[PDB]
Amino acid sequence: HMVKVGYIQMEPKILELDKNYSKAEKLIKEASKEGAKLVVLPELFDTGYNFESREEVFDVAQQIPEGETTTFLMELARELGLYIVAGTAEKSGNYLYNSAVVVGPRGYIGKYRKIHLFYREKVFFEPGDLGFKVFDIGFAKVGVMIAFDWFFPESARTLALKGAEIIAHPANLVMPYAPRAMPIRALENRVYTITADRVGEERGLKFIGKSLIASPKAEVLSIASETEEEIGVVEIDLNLARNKRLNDMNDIFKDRREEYYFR
């Protein structure tokens, strides 16, 4: 029930997919050498984020799972024998999704499409349409949400109610709030959260770094720098997320009272 997990905090170079593959591969191998069995890459790690036109991301975005971002992550996951959640610009026909792929030592596992688009993402991407999915990676159930999804408590809650024990959270954070909020997201759902942020400035847009892993007890287990590329790997106890007990008289999920919510 003890597993080592980690984020990959990296600086995507916008439109330079290959360079971004090489950087992700370098850091994931570092995380692998620290024993990470699950690693999370930031939102849109392959394409970067601050596009000027839909055309410039459309011209580089890859298809899932045939495209080269997914196939690259598949080869790396098979080579290292770990699981990867990574944000990627999804090409699907004539459309773009702000997505995340999940891959493991045996290949593609599935994808999530960002349900809550943030700001100018609505210019480029279609709203996610696959719902909030939880993926079985053998030793854990991992839910996936992307960046702004954190702002809506319903995102983490839906994943957690579907059995997610870890929420993998690729992010390109620009607002200051998520590092303060994610321990609450972890605590209120009694899950672990892995927020893999990017760093850097991109056409004048500053990302905040501060990738962090939070425990079901709102403990910040690891937090990254504001500006530097780095990994963070920690050993987590999945029993602490499977057991929703707060004390001998409160089980968080058994204590929910759906009849009084949203009505």
Ligand X SMILES: NC(=O)CCCC(N)=O
Part of the chain binding ligand X (CB under 6 A), chosen from 16-24, 56-64, 172-180, 213-221: 172-180
State the binding string over 99-128 for ligand X (x if CB under 6 A, else -).
-------------------x----------
174 contact, one of its own copies, ligand X, none, CB 5-8 Å limit per kind: ligand X
147 contact, one of ligand X, its own copies, none, CB 5-8 Å limit per kind: ligand X
Number of residues interacting with ligand X: please give it, by CB under 6 A: 11
* Residues in contact with its own copies by the rule CB under 8 A: 115-116, 118-120, 122, 127-128, 131-132, 148, 151-155, 157-158, 161, 177, 180-181, 183-184, 187-188, 218, 246-247, 249-250, 252, 255-258, 260-263
120 contact, one of its own copies, ligand X, none, CB 5-8 Å limit per kind: its own copies
Cα separations in angstroms, 36 against 5, 191, 198 = 5, 18, 19
Which of residues 15 and 220 has its CB atom nearest to its own copies in the complex? 220
204 contact, one of its own copies, ligand X, none, CB 5-8 Å limit per kind: none
Q: d(Cα 141, Cα 133) in Å, to the nearest integer? A: 10
Is the CB of residue 141 less than 8 Å from the CB of residue 163?
yes
The minimum distance between CB 63 and its own copies, in angstroms, equals 23
Nearest Cα to 70, choosing from 95, 104, 37, 93?
A: 104
Question: In degrees rounded to 5, what are phi and psi of residue 45?
Answer: -70, -25
**72 part of the interface to ligand X, by CB under 6 A:** no
Part of the chain binding ligand X (CB under 6 A), chosen from 13-21, 78-86, 159-167, 168-176: 168-176
Question: In degrees rounded to 5, what are phi and psi of residue 251?
Answer: -110, 120
Residue from 107, 120, 130, 175 that binds ligand X (CB under 6 A)? 175
Residue from 148, 183, 212, 223 that binds ligand X (CB under 6 A)? 148
Which residues sit at the interface with ligand X, rule CB under 6 A? Answer: 43, 118, 147-148, 171-175, 177-178
